[PDB]
């Protein structure tokens, strides 16, 4: 496995490039060696292939997902209806539980980091393969206060993503980041009113996921037994049909 055997096609976007070998496409993220392994094979995690290290740079070869991220798809859709948001949130929750069972706290969950499989499924990344800094829309209250802080933070972020999937804008999103920090520490959740109202089960899930109390917050077991996820076949989730499929 040589690094020069990857014809760099297009830059994806701390930089990722679309490389090519024998017809196969790959997402190669570059990390400068100044900053600076273990395989995690899971249906809801971006599969990593190689970790080639050249002169003064380290290269990460991962599978290429043409579906993009969930933030862009959310901007196209404006917002997801309930069943799409619950499917996506379910898959992200299985990824989170797989990550916690391996001793990993994702610490940076957001729609930017959720990639879309060719069959419509969700794969997480930027959890240890790649990673204070704004935006603080997805940080838990215990993160702002500078305290410890365990894996429950990953679920708080989930409660944000859920809300963001259902309404369109994140709940604690506001003008300046200080105002956002206030909205988080005060837990001012701008519930939609009128005909755009959230269902009681959705409101319950967003409430139990966004609890200020670290030890009273929701986890994998809480969502499993939650009325919003009672239609979820957890033991066989990577074979459900997804509302959006990327092509070509
Ligand atoms: Cl968990």
Numbering used by the authors: 30 to 42, 47 to 69, 85 to 179, 738 to 854
The authors write:
Although highly related at the amino acid sequence level to the N- and C-terminal kinase lobes of the MAST kinases (microtubule-associated serine/threonine kinase; MAST1, 2, 3 and 4) and other AGC kinases, GWL has a highly unusual architecture, with an ~500 amino acid insertion between the DFG and APE motifs of the activation segment connecting the N- and C-terminal lobes (NCMR; non-conserved middle region). We therefore excised the NCMR of hGWL and replaced it with four amino acids 496 - RTFC - 499 taken from human PKCα, to generate the expression construct ‘hGWL-KinDom’ (see Experimental Section). Diffracting crystals of hGWL-KinDom in complex with STU were obtained from commercially available screens. The structure was determined by molecular replacement, and refined at a resolution of 3.1Å. As expected, hGWL-KinDom adopts the classical ‘two-lobe’ protein kinase domain fold. As both the C-helix and activation loop regions are disordered in electron density maps, this strongly suggests that just the non-phosphorylated form of hGWL-KinDom (in complex with STU) was selectively incorporated into protein crystals. As expected, STU occupies the nucleotide-binding pocket, making hydrogen bonds to the backbone carbonyl and nitrogen of hinge residues Glu111 and Leu113, via its lactam nitrogen (N6) and oxygen (O6) groups, respectively (nomenclature as described in). It is also ‘sandwiched’ on both sides, by several hydrophobic residues, including Ile41, Val49, Ala60 and Leu163 from the N-lobe, and Thr173 and Leu163 from the C-lobe. In electron density maps, we can observe amino acids 825-854 of the GWL C-terminal extension, containing both the C-lobe anchor (CLA) and the majority of the C-lobe tether (CLT) motifs (bottom). As in other AGC-kinases, such as PDK1 and PKCα, the GWL C-terminal extension wraps across one face of the C-lobe, making an extensive series of predominantly hydrophobic interactions.
The mitotic kinase MASTL (microtubule-associated serine/threonine kinase-like) - more commonly known as Greatwall kinase or GWL - belongs to the AGC family of serine/threonine protein kinases and has recently emerged as a potential target for cancer chemoprevention. GWL exerts its biological activity by phosphorylating α-endosulfine (ENSA) and/or cAMP-regulated phosphoprotein 19 (ARPP19). Once phosphorylated, these proteins become potent inhibitors of the protein phosphatase 2A complex (PP2A/B55). Negative regulation of PP2A/B55 by GWL thus results in a positive feedback loop that boosts CDK1 activity above the threshold required for mitotic entry.
